[PDB]
Amino acid sequence: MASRLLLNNGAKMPILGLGTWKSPPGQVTEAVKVAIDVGYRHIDCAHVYQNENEVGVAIQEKLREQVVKREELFIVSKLWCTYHEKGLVKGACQKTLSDLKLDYLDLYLIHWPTGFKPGKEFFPLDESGNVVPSDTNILDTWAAMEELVDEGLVKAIGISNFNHLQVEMILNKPGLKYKPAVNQIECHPYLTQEKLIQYCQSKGIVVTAYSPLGSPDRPWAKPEDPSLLEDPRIKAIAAKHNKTTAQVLIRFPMQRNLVVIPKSVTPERIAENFKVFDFELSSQDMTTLLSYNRNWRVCALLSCTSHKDYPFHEEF
Ligand SMILES: NC(=O)c1ccc[n+]([C@@H]2O[C@H](COP(=O)([O-])OP(=O)(O)OC[C@H]3O[C@@H](n4cnc5c(N)ncnc54)[C@H](OP(=O)(O)O)[C@@H]3O)[C@@H](O)[C@H]2O)c1
Numbered sequence: 607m608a609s610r611l612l613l614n615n616g617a618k619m620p621i622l623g624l625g626t627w628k629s630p631p632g633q634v635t636e637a638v639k640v641a642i643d644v645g646y647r648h649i650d651c652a653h654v655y656q657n658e659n660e661v662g663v664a665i666q667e668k669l670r671e672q673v674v675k676r677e678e679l680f681i682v683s684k685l686w687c688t689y690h691e692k693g694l695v696k697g698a699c700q701k702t703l704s705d706l707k708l709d710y711l712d713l714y715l716i717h718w719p720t721g722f723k724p725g726k727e728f729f730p731l732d733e734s735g736n737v738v739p740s741d742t743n744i745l746d747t748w749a750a751m752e753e754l755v756d757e758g759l760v761k762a763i764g765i766s767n768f769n770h771l772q773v774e775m776i777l778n779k780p781g782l783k784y785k786p787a788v789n790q791i792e793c794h795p796y797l798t799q800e801k802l803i804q805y806c807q808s809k810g811i812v813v814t815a816y817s818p819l820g821s822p823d824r825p826w827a828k829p830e831d832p833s834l835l836e837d838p839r840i841k842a843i844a845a846k847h848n849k850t851t852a853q854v855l856i857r858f859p860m861q862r863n864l865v866v867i868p869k870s871v872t873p874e875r876i877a878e879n880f881k882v883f884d885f886e887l888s889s890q891d892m893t894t895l896l897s898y899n900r901n902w903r904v905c906a907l908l909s910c911t912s913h914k915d916y917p918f919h920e921e922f
């Protein structure tokens with residue numbers, strides 16, 4: 607199938623990208639270099655991951671070696687919650703561009719709809735442990751994001767972890783200049799997101815599925831949580847196609863017209879995860895995979911369930 611998807615800004619976004627959350631600074635440079643060598647042209651980053659400087663080193667080296675041209679790459683980053691205030695958005699984007707060593711981003715996303723109190727702490731908590739919110743609203747933050755497009759800093763803007771009512775809020779914003787091009791959300795067989803995906807696609811918004819493998823290395827992974835990589839039913843489907851369960855889990859969202867960003871710092875897995883364009887899951891396989899949904903969430907942002915903009919109280 608097509609290796610890239612058309613965005614509403616006219617640009618094409620590679621449907622397969624490399625995730626970098628939890629990728630150690632001392633290993634992420636080699637991971638990104640190997641990914642580019644193998645064919646990856648889309649890298650998903652974020653200032654909150656604390657490794658954007660090292661990711662930038664890999665990108666610059668490959669541009670310098672002439673393995674790829676800048677226009678061939680699709681680099682994505684995200685605005686953290688403590689910079690939702692209108693006057694802090696540009697500076698947050700500039701820090702990311704400085705670390706990645708690029709003069710523009712192909713896509714910049716609002717990481718979460720929730721704004722936090724500005725400061726050096728990524729998760730500011732009060733004397734009682736709750737996250738301290740900021741009195742900023744999604745609409746004002748969006749206007750600040752639109753300004754980055756007009757200034758040439760980013761080619762497209764989008765959102766992440768927004769529920770359908772929050773997406774609707776932006777689409778109905780008075781004076782809306784640029785519609786969100788992408789909504790990056792958690793999606794895998796245990797959290798299929800049928801309703802939200804249908805809603806977004808019907809509005810011309812491309813959906814990127816994160817944690818496609820169930821984020822086995824998530825820090826809060828409890829010793830006996832569900833495990834997609836070891837689900838016997840998924841292993842059976844992979845065996846039938848002579849592919850690994852990870853390849854099946856990556857091919858799954860692709861056939862739903864979604865962009866997918868598996869994360870890996872292991873050279874052999876980075877290469878294996880890219881060999882997903884040579885096989886096809888049947889309609890029966892897809893429907894079966896969709897039946898495994900349990901509404902199980904890897905990223906629930908539990909510390910902000912009290913925030914006025916917490917996205918997961920709504921059904922979708
Ligand atoms: N917008 C948001 O709020 C948000 C939230 C969560 C995630 N994300 C993004 O989505 C990306 C992916 O999600 P994620 O990091 O949560 O997890 P993931 O991609 O679902 O899983 C990553 C884990 O799977 C392993 N792995 C990779 N390929 C494998 C293979 N072929 N076989 C067996 N194991 C394999 C990795 O190990 P090794 O690395 O050791 O190989 C790592 O432990 C992120 O890195 C980030 O860019 C964004």
Ligand SMILES: Cc1ccccc1CC(=O)Nc1cc(C)c(S(=O)(=O)NCC(=O)O)c(C)c1
Pocket residue numbers: 627652654655825826905907
């Ligand atoms: C428990 C624990 C132990 C060691 C190191 C970190 C943590 C907690 C942790 O990982 N926090 C956290 C960090 C980030 C950076 C995000 S996030 O919002 O950035 N989502 C992940 C992503 O975007 O890939 C979230 C939700 C929680």
